[PDB]
Enzyme design. Structure first.
Site, PDB file in Angstrom:
ATOM      1  CB  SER A   1     -19.766 -93.414  34.023  1.00 37.65           C
ATOM      2  OG  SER A   1     -19.453 -94.170  32.886  1.00 37.65           O
TER       3      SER A   1
ATOM      4  CG  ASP B   1     -25.865 -97.978  32.777  1.00 41.14           C
ATOM      5  OD1 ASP B   1     -25.050 -97.986  31.875  1.00 41.14           O
ATOM      6  OD2 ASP B   1     -25.666 -97.286  33.767  1.00 41.14           O
TER       7      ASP B   1
ATOM      8  CG  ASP C   1     -31.419 -97.967  29.562  1.00 38.65           C
ATOM      9  OD1 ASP C   1     -31.614 -97.553  28.419  1.00 38.65           O
ATOM     10  OD2 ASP C   1     -32.131 -98.853  30.048  1.00 38.65           O
ATOM     11  CG  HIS C   2     -23.839 -95.120  31.229  1.00 39.09           C
ATOM     12  ND1 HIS C   2     -23.655 -95.341  32.507  1.00 39.09           N
ATOM     13  CD2 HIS C   2     -22.681 -94.690  30.682  1.00 39.09           C
ATOM     14  CE1 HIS C   2     -22.422 -95.059  32.793  1.00 39.09           C
ATOM     15  NE2 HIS C   2     -21.847 -94.669  31.690  1.00 39.09           N
TER      16      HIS C   2
END
Length: 265
Positions: A141, A200, A252-253
């Site tokens: 991230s 994501d 989906d992250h």
């Protein structure tokens, strides 16, 4: 130009998502211990050399050495409140002073300057202690933006690092810079592998309409765990995760190859 991934590569990309996940266990940073499940699973003999925390931007990270694997790992993470990392961002730029014509995201670069004096002499010291070892930089991230700027600055400011012993891996990484910066990254020759999982959202923000572009080769988890297509160009194609946009998701992250990325589960 759009290949499937060899399981050998799926294994490699999983090893690094697992190390990027360790950065979310408090016990690793700021806890200064390598006794977490992912920890012990991917680099069992790791000695934590340092951890650094920025209370201002909640940018955390750590330097880790593994004498067994002859690797010095540099791992980052920003804030794990991801719906507020995404909704509260500004898509404005700062100049990338090393390269004429380049510009990177303004907030990610100010979080980077906040922690550079906390890892960079430690990495330097471990390469003088251990000159044959390689440096892998990694993160999930927001930690992926730091990793790319970190591997690029190690390239720029440390003579001993080059494509032979500097590698960069990110899962869930946001875009970081404008086209000239992208171009420079692929011009360095440092291997950069950007994995993105299914839908994501975060590799899709800041968007291309605002002028941002991703370097590095994309490996997209399409279905579950071993269905990874590789868009082998070193500039982003519309053939991999950009094809699912606008059908995008923050959920989906939160897991990559089934490892929790965000909560140390």
């Amino acid at each position: 130009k759009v290949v499937a991934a060899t399981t050998a590569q799926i294994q490699e990309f999983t090893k690094y998502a697992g190390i990027a996940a360790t950065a979310y266990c408090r016990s690793v940073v700021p806890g200064n211990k390598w006794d977490c499940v992912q920890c012990q699973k991917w680099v069992p003999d790791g000695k934590i050399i340092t951890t650094f925390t920025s209370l201002l931007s909640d940018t955390n990270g750590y330097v880790l050495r593994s004498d067994k694997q002859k690797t010095i790992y540099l791992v980052f993470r920003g804030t794990n409140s991801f719906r507020s990392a995404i909704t509260d961002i500004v898509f404005n730029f700062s100049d990338y002073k090393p390269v004429k014509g380049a510009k990177v995201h303004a907030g990610f670069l100010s979080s980077y300057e906040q922690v550079v004096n906390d890892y960079f002499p430690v990495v330097q010291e471990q390469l003088t202690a251990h000159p044959t070892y390689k440096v892998i930089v990694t993160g999930h991230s927001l930690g992926g933006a730091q990793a790319l700027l970190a591997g690029m600055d190690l390239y720029q400011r440390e003579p001993r690092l080059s494509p032979k012993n500097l590698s960069i891996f990110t899962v869930g990484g946001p875009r970081v810079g404008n086209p000239t910066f992208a171009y420079y990254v692929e011009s360095t020759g440092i291997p950069f592998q950007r994995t993105v999982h299914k839908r994501d959202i975060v590799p899709h923000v800041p968007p291309q309409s605002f002028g941002f572009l991703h370097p590095g080769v994309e490996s997209w988890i399409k279905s579950g765990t071993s269905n990874v297509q590789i868009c082998t160009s070193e500039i982003e194609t519309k053939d991999c995760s950009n094809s699912i946009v606008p059908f995008t998701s923050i959920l989906d992250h939160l897991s990559y190859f089934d490892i929790n990325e965000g909560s140390c589960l």
